[PDB]
Amino acid sequence: EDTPQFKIDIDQEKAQALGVSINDINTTLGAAWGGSYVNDFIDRGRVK
Amino acid sequence: STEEFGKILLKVNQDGSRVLLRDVAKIELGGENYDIIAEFNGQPASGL
Amino acid sequence: SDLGKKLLEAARAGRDDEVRILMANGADVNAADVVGWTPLHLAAYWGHLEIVEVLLKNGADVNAYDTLGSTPLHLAAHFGHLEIVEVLLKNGADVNAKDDNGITPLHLAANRGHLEIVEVLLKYGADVNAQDKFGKTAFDISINNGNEDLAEILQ
Incomplete structure (x- = not known):
């Protein structure tokens, strides 16, 4: 079933006025709230 | 919707006025391409 | 609350007869879920008019607000529920209630182009000059959205 969710609206005008890119x-x-896969590294010989 | 595309904010001028996408373009639902136009016994048609 | 939860579920679902029994049994009309919605919030959002009326008759807080400061009138106005907007206002809904962003029922109705709802809000003393946190009025919204009819109403 449908559940409550948090709708957040970026104000484009204010962002442009402040010089903050979308x-x-x-x-x-x-990245902060959802996480981001950046790239891989090698942990004891296995790519992770 | 066309309305939403129309209000895309392209920029804010120095005097604080807003340049929207609809101020530099016409916005409409139209074909991906306009090359192929079909008729069935003289009347407008589509087909597969 | 056992029955408060049942009431939240029933208000949302629009189960009219189930709301009645729950009112008979004293289910808490001021029950709130985790985001601060009351049954009245739920019924307003989902457009269940009879349930709105029943809840108001049973002493629902008409100006209950959620964890971000939104009220049933905010929801009814936003989602185009004219009758519910009217009922809420008749029952003393704050027509100029601001949420935590400084957004009002008029702002929301304007944004979705709900003409009739805007007129009702205006008729009950909606402040046409009220600004949200970005300094915007319902008029500003109408212009940005290119709603000519709504712009003319807001002079």
Whole structure:
């Protein structure tokens, strides 16, 4: 069933006025709250 | 919707006025391409 | 509350007869879920008019607000529920209630282009000059959205 969700609206005008890019806003929001797969590293010989 | 595309904010001018997408373009639902136009016995048609 | 939860579920579902029995049995009309919605919030959002009326008759807080400061009138106005908007206002809903963003029922009705609802709100003393946190009025919204009819109403 449908559940409550948190709708957040970015104000484009204010962002442009402050000189804040939409990509930075969305990366910051998504990376922090959702997580982001950056790239791989090698842990004791296995790529992870 | 066309309305939503129309209010995409392209920029804010120095005097604080807003340049929206609809101020530099016409916005409509139209074909991906306009090359192929069919008729059935003289009347407008589509087909597969 | 056992019955409060049942009431939240029934208000949302629009189960009219189930709401009645729950009212008979004293189910808490001021029950709130985790985001601060009351049965009245739920019924307002989902457009269940009879249930709104029943809840108001049974002493629902008409100006209950959620964890972000939104009220049933906010929801009814936003989602185009004219009759419910009217009922709420008749029952003393704060027509100028601001949520935590400074958004009002007029702002919301304007944004979705709900003409009749805007007029009702205006008729009950909606402040046409009220600004949200970005300094915007219902008029500003109407202009940005290109709603000519709504712009003319808001002079």
